Amino acid sequence: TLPLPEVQCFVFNVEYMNCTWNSSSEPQPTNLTLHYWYKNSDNDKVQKCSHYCQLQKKEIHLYQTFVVQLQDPREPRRQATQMLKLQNLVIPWAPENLTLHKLSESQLELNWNNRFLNHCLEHLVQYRTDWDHSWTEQSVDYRHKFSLPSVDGQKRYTFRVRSRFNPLCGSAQHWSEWSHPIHWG
Amino acid sequence: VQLVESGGGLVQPGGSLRLSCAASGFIFSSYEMHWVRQAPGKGLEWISYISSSGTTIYYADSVKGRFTISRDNAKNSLYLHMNSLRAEDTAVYYCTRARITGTFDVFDIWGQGTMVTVS
Amino acid sequence: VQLVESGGGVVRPGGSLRLSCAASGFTFDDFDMSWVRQGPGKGLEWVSGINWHGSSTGYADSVKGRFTISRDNAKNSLYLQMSSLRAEDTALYHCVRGGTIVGATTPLDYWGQGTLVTVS
Amino acid sequence: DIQMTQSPSSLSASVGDRVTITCRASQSISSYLNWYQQKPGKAPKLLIFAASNLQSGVPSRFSGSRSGTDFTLTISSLQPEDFATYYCQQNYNIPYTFGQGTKLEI
Amino acid sequence: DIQMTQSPSSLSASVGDRVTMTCRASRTISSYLSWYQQKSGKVPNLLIFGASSLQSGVPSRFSASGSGTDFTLIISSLQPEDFATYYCQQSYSSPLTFGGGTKVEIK
Ligand SMILES: *[C@@H]1O[C@H](CO)[C@@H](O[C@@H]2O[C@H](CO)[C@@H](O)[C@H](O)[C@H]2NC(C)=O)[C@H](O)[C@H]1NC(C)=O
């Protein structure tokens, strides 16, 4: 007949877990119940969220299996459920304190410290230039340093960086939110 | 209570064909789907799963970058079409569901399966 | 590639009115917006602008203390709500793709039409 | 990923025996394991789940023990209506891996 | 702030003439100044790119030079679709400002 409004869940920098589902599409808007359980660990239980959802770091286990489900009170028979690789859906905070420093007269290096995770993240940088129609991309390895080989004096560049939980400890595809745009003068 | 799958019979290397699996008797929009391939002599080998409606993930190597799968909730169908077949993929194909009893998810009601041959 | 705004009406001095414009066919986060006005007697004039992140809002000489631009990338729109107006604010308002306030990536501009607002 | 071998034990039985079929997983899966009885040319049946529990509608003769990652399926008082290959598989983590499957024979 | 005076506002020329026109800026800008064209009763459009280059979709007939303080524009082999206002504009230091206005006559 009708499908449930579904849900995407993203772990934010391994601080708390947030699942957001839009109840606007269905008639008679309702904030349905949410559940969760960790299959991987032995001696496990089915828990109720009751924090409308949100889960604290006390109940987040990575590198392992996690299952989410949504239940509506009117029709208990009908529900939803998904199987999630929690290391495939980590969306950390946008990196803070995007430090720029200038090693040589014609090349640049970029540094940024993520909030919690260091050794399991890949990065992307987009830089532009004066009058540029487009934006030039470049990927970075698990190390958090990117180098721009060619720069110009009078021209000015805009850098925005988003990290990604890939590939050493997962295969997350979605990118982080754009950080505060650090501007070169 | 019923999973009936149908698909093509014959194909040459590099060819293609259609595989479908019709479900009836339960709320198809809730559970998890699974596709499994049985070789003529090797045995069973699970190849792919579908997580309700959102995500789908295939096997590590056998079907890693050749087949793609999807489903339709309104029509109650689960289908994948095979591309770039080979001589070792001549097998039988199974469509089954996953049920969560407590904290456990177990395979329930397997499909009858269809034969695919290459020669 | 189009820019469409909403609004209309008249108010005596000291009133308020919201002007919201949205972009279609663009990558909103990639480039920033601006505002340009024209009174029938004179030529074009610039109002204000930001940097696609709501962090470097720009001012003008005369409209500095009234209101300054707001943006919502998630909703993909831009807002300018005037209040405590004056008789010399009767003009036609356009919101323009492009512009720049902070340094770097000064992308020029692409105009997007507008409508008229008047106050006594 | 987690390759899951199985002791062959392809030994003849009779009308009523007590035989152990053990399939040690390479990694220590806590309690997640299913026993599938695959008839020739048909689909599996999911004899036992949770490595200790029992599926509804299944005779009580089958029983899992789980003696320290050495999962075993025991059958007492064998009947002729039970002669087929058995595959034990783990649902602990994707990708799911089956086993070689013992060809239990009369 | 930054003030732009687009002068002269009144010009006298006919079809196929060679007269460049200038823009002036109160404060120095290196190469941040574009140009626009305003035929009566329609939205302006971009005519000169950042400093001296040209946007695509425009005939190569229009030309510009003198980047810096006094930008200049020049057009050759005038057509019946080129008499308008130019409105030199800068995007160097906020707030942005436009020019005065130049009007060209038809004979
Ligand atoms: C994380 O989860 C919390 C818990 O709901 C969210 O907080 C609220 O989100 C809803 C969504 O519209 C709104 O009531 C408010 O935006 C939030 N309430 C507040 C902040 O008091 C939160 O939006 C989720 N996401 C983030 C990034 O925190």
XYZ file of C-alpha atoms and ligand atoms in Angstrom:
665
model
C 0.000 0.000 0.000
C 2.329 2.722 1.266
C 6.016 2.759 2.245
C 7.461 4.088 5.461
C 9.295 7.427 5.125
C 12.638 5.529 5.461
C 15.715 6.817 7.303
C 19.378 7.634 6.755
C 21.696 7.259 9.747
C 25.107 8.916 10.006
C 27.665 8.742 12.811
C 29.038 12.240 13.410
C 32.765 12.082 14.208
C 32.018 9.172 16.578
C 30.474 11.424 19.222
C 26.766 10.637 18.881
C 24.562 8.895 16.340
C 21.776 10.733 14.511
C 18.988 9.245 12.401
C 16.769 11.743 10.588
C 13.508 10.775 8.894
C 10.977 13.175 7.375
C 7.447 12.549 8.645
C 6.014 15.398 6.552
C 5.171 13.300 3.484
C 2.812 10.949 5.305
C -0.585 12.265 6.440
C -1.188 13.002 10.118
C 2.451 13.778 11.003
C 3.819 11.540 13.739
C 7.238 11.048 15.326
C 7.476 7.256 15.251
C 9.488 5.096 17.633
C 13.036 3.960 16.857
C 14.989 0.866 17.913
C 18.485 -0.548 17.533
C 20.694 -3.467 18.494
C 24.303 -4.539 17.978
C 24.410 -8.057 16.562
C 28.212 -8.330 16.636
C 28.824 -8.260 20.384
C 27.776 -11.249 22.458
C 25.368 -10.768 25.373
C 23.300 -8.167 23.529
C 19.792 -6.801 24.014
C 17.135 -4.989 22.000
C 16.937 -1.409 23.246
C 14.493 1.490 22.981
C 15.810 4.909 21.986
C 13.434 7.278 23.831
C 15.721 10.262 23.078
C 13.919 11.762 20.096
C 16.679 9.676 17.182
C 19.929 10.052 19.101
C 22.369 7.589 20.649
C 25.309 8.568 22.824
C 28.867 7.297 22.463
C 28.116 4.845 25.290
C 26.172 2.762 22.748
C 28.230 3.122 19.563
C 30.420 0.238 18.377
C 32.311 0.553 15.102
C 34.165 -1.986 12.936
C 31.137 -4.219 13.401
C 27.495 -4.856 12.538
C 24.617 -2.533 13.434
C 20.902 -2.803 12.671
C 18.292 -0.032 12.803
C 14.524 -0.187 12.523
C 11.494 2.100 12.688
C 8.147 1.148 14.194
C 4.805 2.927 13.953
C 2.207 2.533 16.727
C -0.876 2.178 14.513
C 0.259 -0.903 12.540
C 2.808 -2.963 14.512
C 2.931 -5.569 11.734
C 4.330 -3.017 9.274
C 7.782 -1.622 10.048
C 11.185 -0.982 8.484
C 14.664 -2.422 8.970
C 18.098 -2.038 7.403
C 21.560 -3.555 7.772
C 24.292 -0.934 8.038
C 28.071 -1.113 7.918
C 28.780 1.537 10.537
C 32.253 2.152 9.104
C 30.664 2.839 5.702
C 28.509 5.761 6.883
C 30.712 7.912 9.130
C 30.255 11.615 8.378
C 32.684 13.417 10.706
C 32.524 17.077 11.596
C 33.920 19.492 9.069
C 37.614 19.835 9.973
C 38.419 22.697 12.315
C 41.305 25.210 12.358
C 42.149 24.831 8.687
C 45.778 25.885 8.974
C 47.611 27.182 5.906
C 51.340 27.789 5.795
C 53.676 28.572 2.944
C 56.755 26.366 2.649
C 58.255 27.895 -0.505
C 57.753 30.870 -2.807
C 55.570 29.014 -5.330
C 53.942 26.072 -3.518
C 51.575 25.636 -0.593
C 50.732 23.053 2.061
C 47.402 22.597 3.842
C 46.812 21.130 7.314
C 43.613 20.403 9.211
C 42.878 18.440 12.385
C 39.691 16.414 12.511
C 37.885 16.289 15.838
C 38.306 12.638 16.804
C 39.524 10.370 13.995
C 42.931 10.515 12.297
C 44.108 7.153 10.932
C 40.965 6.105 9.038
C 40.098 9.147 6.900
C 40.669 10.206 3.307
C 40.359 13.821 2.233
C 39.460 16.043 -0.717
C 40.397 19.664 -1.411
C 38.829 22.105 -3.883
C 40.686 25.305 -4.728
C 39.691 28.078 -7.123
C 41.321 31.212 -8.512
C 40.386 34.684 -9.725
C 37.925 34.689 -12.633
C 37.958 30.888 -12.629
C 34.725 29.383 -13.912
C 35.362 25.963 -12.369
C 36.896 24.379 -9.267
C 39.946 22.108 -9.319
C 39.888 18.942 -7.204
C 42.553 16.654 -5.764
C 42.381 13.689 -3.403
C 44.639 13.104 -0.398
C 45.668 9.873 1.321
C 45.050 8.947 4.961
C 47.644 11.579 5.827
C 46.042 14.990 6.326
C 48.381 17.153 4.208
C 47.696 18.450 0.688
C 50.204 20.329 -1.466
C 49.432 22.856 -4.193
C 52.420 22.744 -6.570
C 51.707 25.940 -8.540
C 50.525 29.227 -7.016
C 50.486 32.856 -8.116
C 51.149 36.007 -6.130
C 48.429 38.449 -7.142
C 45.772 35.772 -7.642
C 43.732 34.669 -4.631
C 42.479 31.153 -3.876
C 39.585 29.727 -1.861
C 40.038 26.364 -0.133
C 37.282 24.185 1.288
C 38.007 20.703 2.632
C 35.764 17.740 3.389
C 37.036 14.480 4.859
C 35.814 10.941 4.212
C 35.945 7.710 6.227
C 37.899 5.660 3.692
C 39.636 3.280 2.886
C 41.821 1.850 5.657
C 38.979 1.307 8.147
C 35.916 1.382 5.904
C 34.530 2.406 2.542
C 32.391 5.451 3.301
C 31.466 7.329 0.122
C 29.590 10.390 1.386
C 31.692 13.473 2.040
C 31.743 15.662 5.122
C 30.113 19.066 5.199
C 32.233 21.821 3.696
C 34.385 23.423 6.364
C 34.633 27.142 6.990
C 36.085 28.524 3.748
C 39.641 29.588 4.500
C 40.560 32.425 2.149
C 44.004 33.302 0.870
C 44.625 37.031 0.659
C 4.633 -17.408 1.636
C 5.705 -17.509 -2.011
C 8.831 -16.497 -3.933
C 8.834 -17.414 -7.637
C 11.812 -16.481 -9.806
C 12.217 -16.606 -13.583
C 15.078 -15.855 -15.935
C 16.795 -16.559 -19.209
C 17.916 -19.941 -20.467
C 20.787 -19.531 -22.939
C 23.563 -16.982 -23.437
C 27.003 -16.607 -25.139
C 29.988 -14.961 -23.394
C 29.495 -11.211 -23.297
C 25.707 -11.554 -23.487
C 22.944 -10.511 -21.120
C 19.607 -11.673 -19.725
C 16.912 -10.818 -17.184
C 16.263 -12.381 -13.770
C 13.186 -11.577 -11.682
C 11.693 -12.759 -8.382
C 8.034 -12.164 -7.499
C 6.999 -12.178 -3.833
C 3.572 -12.834 -2.361
C 2.185 -13.376 1.129
C 3.917 -10.758 3.318
C 4.844 -7.081 3.607
C 7.569 -6.996 0.956
C 8.565 -3.438 1.896
C 9.928 -4.407 5.335
C 12.263 -7.404 5.193
C 15.685 -8.061 3.663
C 16.223 -9.844 0.344
C 19.041 -12.224 -0.611
C 20.291 -13.664 -3.913
C 22.385 -16.845 -3.847
C 24.106 -18.828 -6.617
C 24.720 -22.585 -6.607
C 27.433 -23.963 -8.872
C 26.902 -27.373 -10.523
C 29.530 -29.065 -8.357
C 31.048 -26.515 -5.992
C 27.969 -25.904 -3.843
C 26.263 -22.785 -2.552
C 27.590 -19.227 -2.587
C 25.672 -16.153 -1.443
C 26.113 -13.274 -3.902
C 23.990 -10.277 -2.920
C 21.507 -8.738 -0.501
C 18.999 -5.889 -0.494
C 18.353 -3.892 2.698
C 14.626 -3.153 2.562
C 14.498 -0.317 0.025
C 17.613 1.770 0.709
C 20.869 -0.078 0.041
C 22.093 -3.174 -1.801
C 25.457 -4.934 -1.516
C 26.852 -7.729 -3.701
C 29.530 -10.400 -3.251
C 33.251 -9.721 -2.922
C 34.502 -10.963 -6.275
C 32.074 -13.164 -8.217
C 29.473 -10.456 -8.860
C 31.544 -7.494 -7.696
C 31.229 -5.394 -10.843
C 29.102 -7.270 -13.367
C 25.501 -7.639 -12.138
C 23.179 -4.972 -10.728
C 19.975 -5.498 -8.754
C 16.908 -3.543 -7.662
C 13.328 -4.001 -6.488
C 9.838 -2.544 -6.819
C 7.682 -2.424 -3.697
C 4.393 -1.589 -5.428
C 4.752 -4.494 -7.865
C 6.433 -6.712 -5.217
C 9.368 -7.643 -7.439
C 13.106 -8.153 -6.939
C 15.185 -8.364 -10.096
C 18.745 -8.277 -11.397
C 20.038 -8.649 -14.947
C 23.344 -10.341 -15.689
C 25.982 -8.821 -17.968
C 29.269 -10.132 -19.384
C 28.583 -13.752 -18.500
C 31.271 -16.432 -18.636
C 31.607 -20.202 -18.870
C 32.006 -20.642 -15.095
C 28.799 -18.756 -14.212
C 26.549 -21.529 -15.556
C 24.681 -22.275 -12.347
C 21.343 -22.182 -10.517
C 19.971 -19.045 -8.879
C 17.998 -18.655 -5.639
C 15.948 -15.792 -4.172
C 15.226 -15.794 -0.431
C 14.201 -13.516 2.431
C 15.627 -12.606 5.831
C 13.577 -12.608 9.037
C 14.612 -11.086 12.368
C 13.345 -13.244 15.225
C 15.015 -11.627 18.218
C 18.424 -10.102 17.644
C 19.082 -12.759 14.974
C 18.451 -12.536 11.237
C 17.926 -15.864 9.486
C 17.240 -16.914 5.914
C 13.619 -17.871 5.318
C 11.563 -19.206 2.390
C 14.068 -19.791 -0.403
C 13.093 -19.391 -4.027
C 12.861 -22.358 -6.350
C 15.782 -21.199 -8.477
C 16.449 -20.941 -12.205
C 19.100 -22.490 -14.445
C 21.534 -20.380 -16.471
C 23.911 -22.029 -18.943
C 26.650 -20.719 -21.234
C 27.931 -22.610 -24.276
C 20.430 29.403 -14.538
C 17.423 31.510 -13.551
C 16.887 33.747 -10.525
C 13.351 34.381 -9.255
C 12.278 36.464 -6.263
C 8.984 36.986 -4.444
C 7.357 40.028 -2.894
C 5.130 43.008 -3.531
C 3.108 45.786 -1.912
C 3.578 49.259 -0.465
C 4.060 50.574 3.072
C 4.371 53.937 4.784
C 7.798 54.841 6.222
C 8.755 52.666 9.171
C 7.259 49.443 7.800
C 8.757 46.070 6.952
C 8.760 43.637 4.036
C 10.606 40.406 3.211
C 12.219 39.741 -0.186
C 13.288 36.156 -0.886
C 14.935 34.970 -4.095
C 15.888 31.488 -5.245
C 18.129 30.055 -7.951
C 17.288 27.294 -10.424
C 19.846 25.393 -12.472
C 22.829 26.197 -10.241
C 25.174 24.585 -7.756
C 24.234 26.972 -4.966
C 27.175 26.264 -2.659
C 29.697 26.771 -5.460
C 29.125 30.506 -5.968
C 27.745 33.410 -3.962
C 24.965 35.990 -4.462
C 24.416 39.754 -4.283
C 21.818 42.510 -4.678
C 21.657 45.443 -7.088
C 18.998 48.161 -7.153
C 17.928 50.791 -9.666
C 15.759 53.837 -9.233
C 14.064 55.108 -12.391
C 15.893 58.433 -12.260
C 19.432 57.121 -11.807
C 21.617 54.121 -12.601
C 22.350 50.848 -10.867
C 23.440 50.634 -7.235
C 24.721 47.795 -5.059
C 23.063 46.768 -1.802
C 24.871 43.876 -0.101
C 26.132 40.305 -0.432
C 27.624 37.273 1.288
C 29.999 34.363 0.566
C 27.788 31.247 0.087
C 28.326 30.315 3.757
C 26.579 33.098 5.680
C 29.824 34.273 7.254
C 30.955 37.442 5.421
C 27.816 39.532 4.992
C 28.419 42.836 3.224
C 27.049 46.296 3.947
C 26.316 49.502 2.054
C 26.810 53.169 2.870
C 23.112 53.995 3.289
C 21.391 50.676 4.093
C 23.998 49.669 6.697
C 21.797 49.859 9.772
C 18.527 48.428 8.439
C 19.141 44.791 7.483
C 21.822 42.554 5.994
C 21.560 39.498 3.787
C 20.702 36.007 5.027
C 21.055 32.689 3.209
C 19.965 29.065 3.541
C 21.849 26.604 1.345
C 19.913 23.588 2.617
C 16.662 25.282 1.614
C 18.543 26.840 -1.340
C 17.341 30.420 -1.006
C 18.412 33.917 -0.013
C 16.541 36.501 2.066
C 16.642 40.274 2.569
C 13.965 41.741 4.849
C 13.801 45.534 4.929
C 12.473 47.416 7.950
C 12.334 51.075 9.021
C 12.403 52.266 5.423
C 12.554 55.775 3.947
C 10.872 57.662 1.118
C 13.987 57.344 -1.083
C 13.885 53.522 -1.136
C 11.473 53.256 -4.079
C 13.312 51.125 -6.627
C 13.363 47.855 -8.548
C 15.376 45.111 -6.853
C 17.421 42.369 -8.536
C 19.363 39.562 -6.864
C 22.372 38.620 -8.966
C 24.493 35.503 -9.251
C 28.142 36.156 -8.531
C 29.711 39.072 -6.711
C 32.439 38.859 -4.103
C 33.111 40.364 -0.684
C 35.971 38.345 0.790
C 39.049 37.719 -1.306
C 39.617 34.940 -3.823
C 37.421 33.551 -6.614
C 35.805 36.782 -7.737
C 33.340 35.179 -10.174
C 31.875 38.308 -11.868
C 28.079 38.111 -12.185
C 24.947 36.943 -14.019
C 21.828 39.061 -13.579
C 18.451 37.544 -12.814
C 15.630 40.095 -13.220
C 13.527 41.617 -10.434
C 10.359 43.425 -9.399
C 9.398 46.821 -8.009
C 8.885 47.969 -4.419
C 7.766 51.448 -3.359
C 7.312 53.340 -0.084
C 5.916 56.798 0.636
C 35.997 -12.978 4.010
C 35.764 -15.318 7.006
C 36.433 -18.678 5.366
C 34.453 -21.333 7.217
C 35.716 -24.891 6.802
C 33.913 -28.073 7.794
C 35.146 -31.447 8.974
C 34.089 -33.905 6.253
C 33.026 -36.825 8.477
C 31.457 -38.348 5.340
C 30.902 -41.599 7.215
C 28.151 -44.155 6.717
C 25.435 -44.355 9.360
C 22.563 -46.724 10.134
C 19.051 -46.619 11.578
C 19.811 -44.796 14.820
C 23.246 -43.341 15.601
C 24.858 -40.364 17.347
C 27.257 -38.561 15.003
C 28.894 -35.161 15.438
C 29.373 -32.825 12.476
C 31.798 -30.057 13.402
C 32.679 -27.018 11.301
C 35.168 -24.677 12.950
C 35.117 -21.084 11.759
C 38.460 -19.419 11.111
C 37.478 -16.515 13.377
C 35.638 -16.746 16.694
C 31.996 -16.035 15.912
C 30.146 -15.765 19.212
C 26.764 -17.416 18.703
C 25.595 -16.753 15.131
C 25.355 -19.880 12.990
C 22.716 -21.687 10.951
C 22.485 -25.308 9.833
C 20.966 -25.876 6.392
C 19.904 -29.315 5.170
C 20.202 -29.166 1.375
C 18.377 -31.957 -0.420
C 19.658 -32.939 -3.886
C 18.265 -30.408 -6.351
C 16.239 -28.402 -3.817
C 16.541 -25.442 -1.442
C 17.880 -25.432 2.138
C 15.655 -25.674 5.217
C 17.352 -23.752 8.099
C 17.446 -26.537 10.674
C 18.878 -24.562 13.599
C 19.637 -20.911 14.331
C 21.532 -19.013 17.045
C 23.836 -22.080 17.243
C 21.841 -23.340 20.231
C 18.192 -22.632 19.443
C 15.785 -24.616 17.262
C 13.562 -23.552 14.383
C 9.817 -24.047 14.724
C 8.473 -27.166 13.049
C 11.869 -28.899 13.258
C 12.316 -32.212 15.126
C 14.157 -32.020 18.437
C 16.800 -34.594 17.452
C 18.997 -31.877 15.954
C 20.881 -29.837 18.539
C 23.810 -27.429 18.504
C 26.380 -27.380 21.289
C 28.864 -24.558 20.541
C 31.851 -25.869 22.488
C 34.165 -22.905 22.041
C 33.915 -21.933 18.352
C 33.665 -25.657 17.553
C 30.047 -25.670 16.449
C 28.642 -29.186 16.240
C 25.287 -30.579 15.157
C 24.275 -33.785 16.911
C 21.564 -36.168 15.730
C 20.254 -39.088 17.775
C 18.186 -41.979 16.387
C 18.787 -41.358 12.696
C 15.934 -42.141 10.316
C 16.096 -43.007 6.597
C 14.156 -39.825 5.774
C 17.281 -37.841 6.760
C 20.123 -38.345 4.267
C 21.495 -35.228 2.584
C 24.349 -32.759 2.630
C 24.503 -30.210 5.444
C 25.918 -26.706 5.099
C 26.707 -24.613 8.164
C 26.998 -20.873 7.579
C 27.621 -17.735 9.605
C 25.520 -14.560 9.572
C 27.961 -12.683 11.802
C 29.153 -10.201 9.178
C 28.842 -9.472 5.464
C 29.943 -11.201 3.270
C 28.172 -14.358 4.375
C 30.251 -17.502 3.875
C 28.931 -21.048 3.628
C 30.857 -24.270 4.241
C 32.049 -27.147 2.090
C 29.176 -29.344 3.237
C 29.424 -32.925 4.442
C 27.947 -35.580 2.162
C 26.503 -37.798 4.865
C 25.806 -41.229 3.402
C 24.008 -44.415 4.396
C 34.058 53.966 -0.242
C 34.799 53.321 -3.931
C 33.178 55.682 -6.442
C 32.932 55.126 -10.201
C 32.253 57.969 -12.645
C 31.345 56.722 -16.129
C 32.078 59.668 -18.420
C 31.242 61.052 -20.858
C 27.509 60.370 -20.607
C 26.804 61.978 -24.001
C 28.493 60.743 -27.182
C 28.116 61.668 -30.855
C 28.781 58.912 -33.391
C 27.190 57.014 -36.275
C 27.305 53.517 -37.782
C 30.929 52.459 -38.196
C 32.871 54.821 -35.940
C 36.081 54.649 -33.890
C 35.558 56.297 -30.484
C 36.621 54.571 -27.275
C 35.010 55.423 -23.946
C 36.499 55.349 -20.475
C 35.584 54.535 -16.892
C 37.147 55.993 -13.751
C 37.508 54.723 -10.188
C 37.979 56.631 -6.944
C 40.258 54.001 -5.374
C 42.859 51.920 -7.175
C 41.949 48.436 -8.398
C 44.412 46.194 -10.210
C 42.277 44.146 -12.609
C 38.872 43.866 -10.901
C 36.492 45.718 -13.220
C 34.002 44.333 -15.740
C 31.611 45.872 -18.262
C 27.924 45.519 -19.070
C 25.453 46.546 -21.766
C 22.018 48.054 -21.067
C 19.640 48.331 -23.980
C 16.508 50.134 -22.844
C 13.865 47.891 -21.319
C 15.871 44.732 -20.643
C 18.185 43.136 -18.083
C 21.888 44.043 -18.426
C 24.366 41.417 -19.588
C 28.083 40.841 -19.146
C 30.225 42.078 -22.027
C 33.833 42.122 -20.777
C 35.266 39.443 -18.503
C 37.441 40.017 -15.435
C 40.092 42.413 -16.753
C 40.283 42.326 -20.564
C 39.016 38.942 -21.791
C 35.583 38.264 -23.282
C 32.793 35.932 -22.233
C 31.741 33.266 -24.710
C 28.516 33.703 -26.650
C 29.482 37.255 -27.656
C 30.833 38.449 -31.028
C 34.565 39.236 -30.957
C 33.704 42.690 -32.241
C 33.815 44.275 -28.775
C 37.236 45.036 -27.314
C 38.578 46.536 -24.094
C 41.901 47.535 -22.566
C 43.583 49.853 -20.076
C 43.087 47.668 -17.018
C 43.679 49.401 -13.698
C 42.488 52.947 -13.030
C 41.025 54.087 -16.369
C 39.516 51.078 -18.091
C 38.589 51.773 -21.717
C 36.239 50.051 -24.150
C 36.076 50.278 -27.944
C 33.786 48.768 -30.588
C 34.288 48.722 -34.363
C 31.916 48.315 -37.316
C 28.893 49.433 -35.335
C 25.611 47.576 -35.853
C 22.010 48.659 -35.182
C 22.148 46.693 -31.885
C 24.980 48.315 -29.917
C 23.728 51.728 -28.695
C 23.230 51.433 -24.933
C 24.701 52.193 -21.499
C 27.812 50.480 -20.142
C 27.965 50.887 -16.334
C 31.517 49.916 -15.429
C 31.508 47.962 -12.169
C 34.181 46.749 -9.752
C 34.333 43.787 -7.376
C 37.593 44.479 -5.533
C 36.676 45.826 -2.075
C 33.255 45.672 -0.455
C 30.897 47.363 -0.906
C 30.650 47.084 -4.687
C 29.665 50.156 -6.692
C 28.615 50.928 -10.252
C 29.367 53.776 -12.639
C 27.471 56.841 -13.753
C 26.193 56.032 -17.230
C 27.035 56.642 -20.891
C 24.474 57.265 -23.640
C 25.236 57.044 -27.368
C 23.077 58.565 -30.100
C 21.812 57.251 -33.446
C 21.868 59.298 -36.640
C 20.799 15.419 15.660
O 19.666 14.972 16.403
C 19.005 16.021 17.123
C 17.891 15.372 17.912
O 16.630 15.567 17.288
C 18.505 17.101 16.164
O 18.026 18.183 16.953
C 16.789 18.729 16.447
O 16.557 18.386 15.095
C 15.221 18.696 14.675
C 15.194 18.567 13.171
O 14.342 19.543 12.586
C 14.809 20.088 15.158
O 13.906 19.961 16.252
C 16.010 20.945 15.555
O 16.774 21.270 14.400
C 16.911 20.241 16.573
N 16.599 20.681 17.924
C 17.461 21.356 18.693
C 18.798 21.649 18.081
O 17.174 21.713 19.830
C 19.632 17.596 15.265
O 19.109 18.453 14.257
C 20.352 16.423 14.605
N 21.470 16.888 13.794
C 22.512 17.586 14.265
C 23.551 17.966 13.255
O 22.615 17.895 15.448
